[PDB]
Amino acid sequence: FKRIVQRIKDFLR
């Protein structure tokens, strides 16, 4: 969940 969530933060930021 931390790995997939990492990509999201990279998407917005």
Curated annotation (Swiss-Prot):
Residues 1-13 are annotated as: Active core. Changing residue 11 to A: Loss of antimicrobial activity against M.luteus. Changing residue 1 to A: Loss of antimicrobial activity against M.luteus. Changing residue 2 to A: Loss of antimicrobial activity against M.luteus. Acts synergistically with peptides KS-30 and KR-31, killing bacteria such as S.aureus, E.coli and C.albicans at lower concentrations when present together, and maintains activity at increased salt condition. Does not have the ability to stimulate CXCL8/IL8 release from keratinocytes. This is Antibacterial peptide KR-20. It comes from Homo sapiens (Human). The gene is CAMP. The chain holds residues 150 to 162 of 170 of the full protein.
